[PDB]
Design a protein around this ligand. Structure first.
Ligand SMILES: Nc1nc2c(ncn2[C@H]2C[C@H](O)[C@@H](COP(=O)(O)OP(=O)(O)OP(=O)(O)O)O2)c(=O)[nH]1
Ligand SMILES: Nc1nc2c(ncn2[C@H]2C[C@H](O)[C@@H](COP(=O)(O)OP(=O)(O)OP(=O)(O)O)O2)c(=O)[nH]1
Ligand SMILES: [Mn+2]
Ligand SMILES: [Mn+2]
Lengths: 492, 503
């Protein structure tokens, strides 16, 4: 039974609002989420994190913020058309949506603005630098089995004892969690553990795009081969992800129903907007582009792109994209809106193992067209490719810079935590001080909650120590990471 | 004259507008289409690089023009929602025509909130300064205030007051003031229409006219619209466009659009407060240091009062007993919330209270002017900021550099304003002229969109006219003011350095 009053939860993790509440009171609860997200520095920090073009110095190219805001308007159009199209059938009052029309919209808009919020300084190359740097240190490939036997892992406590323990299972989880950083998983850690934004459970579920646990070592399941594409949460949040699996009526590895609207609005706006930037960064011409599209496929091309191409020609360039946007928007937003209503049962359970755009439909054929033109003629450009190469070194150098903090022993590091300045560790003292306090309080809070006596305690302290470091790096700008790297290499 | 919002919340455009009936769902769609143009406009992306109080702030954690205009967007929402909700309960809504125009009411504010500042020049009020100063040295409007005569300090020729009329010295008199009175807002109106051409819905385009004074106004203002005409809100280049806009919305001369008063409020409130949040981030002072500046800035506080409900309230809430970024990040969203819960409705009421003078558009006040213990709160920041935030020496210095950057940039392109009409016109037609190598290449730099507006507007002239030379020059300096003003802090900075051969 599709009852959206049972999913759109307006309760919080802390200081929750309780009991009853008007249709207007439940609104103001979600209007408080808007003010919490818009005024957040983590959303401001996006005008300096990069989307497609690293460090692009002309504002006319989209950043993560201007992109996320355009996703926000596409999700509004999709949500408003699902409410209108589902109102053509009046199934709203049958689905519990008769009094949750605003929260339906608002959660999408807000969780559209908050994807990507946890992405590291250099896009898929921050992710790369981090996982690669941690694999070389704590090889998760070796802990896969049992034993045993020549364990190539530089951490002592995390090497598998030959030596069997069920505490060797903790070892296995940690080694794979830390080597599988993901913007989506780090986004959940960001809003809860690090920012403590409070927020409604619904809004916090609207940013959970993936359901695979980072520590997942086994490359399974079929039923959920798509929703478990990338990790969506870390070992450090297994508990929080459980409290939400309850609060939103989600099954294990099941997604929130409104996440599918954002994912559609995300894919829809980056495909076209990246080609708009490419022409602005003068990688090619409006004409040059058109032929790339034609050589890439009466059909849909004529309905959408050909349509805008002839309309553009007697700014022919302004002109070109204003329509291409509209034509794509007029044909793909309704396809998504209906495809949502069509598969609503599996989407409400959050088990639907496909994306809102069907590789079958000619409508999805249009999206893969836009993405393949960009992959061949934009993401392959050499100025993009080296800024990609530079960022991988910046982040990998930052990690090696701070490696001496991961080298200390539990006693020596804990000493450094309490004694802010330790005499015999001047270098580690000053390195520790560079770590943002927010990131430091999260390590303290989580380690305080541990059993001091436990034989697993040393293993958890190191996990949260490595997670504290990953929190620092990832919570950085493209630009702040580059400056810090140069400052600390004594070249600036 | 009855408060009827069917006569204001229009659904028409100036170009390729739809006509006929239109369902309530059709009217929402028509304003949601505007939304897609404003958000997807490059003119708004250009804000993540424009200055907000802090020039070229190198950490995203400080606000730009986009992030500030974004937070203002949310303050106008929280006010329309409290203005209309209070109106549906009493009486009414349907008696004002808002029963079917509820979504458009919100969307108009929300969108025209993102679009203030859209016309602001690269270096804030110092772009405004650098531009008016550089043009005053050329076209002294001080001399053409009266008649004659007698030694016109005007550096142009076809613009000196002659003489010996010519009752066309009034056109001269008008232009000599318009170009010396560029304004972030008046340039915003030119921007959405003449230059960017989004064709926005007359209602939406009325929500951005924060002022009603024409730039060419050479008078000492009136007494009724003695507020709404503090600064210019439009240029002579749009005198006609504002006529048709004043009609479609049934506005009398110098009367504001009813939703603009909401916008000033969303603006007034988001900056003053957010600026102090940044100052603390920039370590100018501490959240503690800040406080002292507030109660030492307050007056007649005595005992229980407003300061206590809002800032005192947040002061004790901050010093432990909750945190999650440790007292400061805490102090700020309480101070934000407290200021918001106790001010958004107050403003909301002021709207409903004077809604006739506010809807007929004549109310010579803003929804936060009166000596109410609530305006007293705004001035507190506002005055705390002007003394200990905007006066910092690193802020004052980058303001000085920006004045030089924009001022040199105008002097670099000064050669195009010196050519004669026939000389300039030739360079326009044949994009490349042989005896003007320097002037040709300077011309190619002037981004097209700005150029098309010069051709478009001049083509529409009477070439035979004795006015034609003077209109050619107005539209020429506007083409230059358009190029400069439509620049980022950083692009204007790089251009000055690229063209001074220092980088
Ligand atoms: N320069 C460059 N840009 C890329 C590359 N791949 C993607 N982009 C741009 C285009 C899009 O804005 C975005 C594409 O990747 P996303 O990870 O944002 O898409 P997707 O939704 O599949 O990932 P997600 O599920 O969010 O983790 O970045 C690349 O390899 N190089
Ligand atoms: N750095 C610096 N910032 C200033 C100064 N005066 C104002 N600001 C900043 C602080 C506020 O963000 C904002 C105040 O002016 P606005 O341009 O936003 O003014 P106003 O509310 O009069 O509306 P308007 O812009 O006239 O439409 O600009 C100054 O002297 N220095
Ligand atoms: Mn995205
Ligand atoms: Mn403002």
């Amino acid at each position: 039974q599709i009852d959206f009053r049972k999913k759109i939860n307006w309760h919080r993790r802390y200081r929750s609002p309780q009991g009853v509440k008007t249709e207007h009171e439940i609104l103001r609860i979600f209007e408080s989420d808007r003010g919490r997200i818009i005024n957040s520095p983590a959303i401001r920090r996006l005008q300096q994190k990069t989307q497609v073009f690293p460090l692009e110095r002309n504002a006319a190219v989209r950043t993560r913020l201007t992109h996320s805001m355009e996703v926000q308007q596409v999700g509004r159009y999709i949500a408003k058309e699902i409410l209108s199209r589902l109102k053509e059938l009046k199934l709203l009052e049958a689905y519990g949506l008769d009094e949750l029309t605003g929260p339906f919209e608002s959660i999408v808009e807000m969780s559209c603005l908050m994807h990507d919020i946890g992405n590291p300084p250099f896009g898929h190359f921050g992710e790369a630098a981090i996982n690669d740097w941690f694999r070389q240190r704590l090889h998760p490939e070796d802990a896969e089995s049992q034993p045993l036997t020549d364990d190539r892992c530089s951490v002592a406590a995390l090497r598998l004892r030959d030596g069997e323990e069920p505490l060797n299972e903790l070892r296995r989880k940690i080694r794979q969690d830390l080597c599988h950083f993901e913007g989506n998983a780090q986004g959940i850690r960001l809003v809860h553990t690090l920012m403590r934004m409070n927020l409604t459970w619904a809004q916090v579920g609207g940013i959970l795009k993936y359901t695979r646990p980072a520590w997942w070592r086994g490359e399974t399941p079929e039923t959920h081969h798509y929703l478990m594409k990338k990790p969506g949460y870390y070992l450090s949040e297994e508990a929080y992800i459980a409290r939400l699996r309850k609060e939103l009526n989600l099954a294990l590895y099941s997604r929130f129903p409104l996440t599918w609207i954002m994912e559609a609005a995300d894919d829809i706006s980056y495909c076209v907007a990246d080609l708009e930037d490419a022409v602005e960064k003068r990688i090619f011409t409006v004409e040059q582009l058109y032929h790339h599209l034609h050589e890439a496929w009466g059909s849909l091309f004529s309905l959408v792109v050909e349509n805008a191409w002839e309309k553009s020609r007697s700014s022919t360039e302004d002109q070109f994209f204003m329509y291409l946007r509209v034509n794509t928007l007029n044909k793909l937003v309704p396809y998504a809106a209906q495809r949502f209503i069509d598969n609503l049962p599996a989407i409400f359970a959050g088990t639907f193992n496909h994306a809102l755009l069907e590789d079958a439909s000619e409508c999805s054929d249009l999206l893969k067209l836009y993405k393949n033109v960009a992959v061949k003629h934009v993401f392959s450009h050499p100025d993009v490719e080296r800024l990609e190469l530079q960022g991988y070194r910046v982040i990998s150098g930052l990690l090696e810079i701070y490696r001496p903090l991961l080298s200390l022993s539990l006693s020596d590091f804990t000493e450094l935590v309490e004694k802010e300045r330790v005499k015999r560790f001047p270098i580690e003292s000053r390195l520790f001080h560079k770590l943002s306090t927010r990131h430091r309080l999260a390590y303290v809070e989580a380690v305080s909650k541990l059993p001091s006596d436990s034989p697993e305690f040393p293993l958890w302290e190191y996990y949260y120590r490595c997670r504290l470091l990953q929190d620092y790096i990832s919570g950085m700008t493209d630009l702040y990471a580059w400056d810090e790297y140069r400052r600390l290499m004594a070249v600036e």
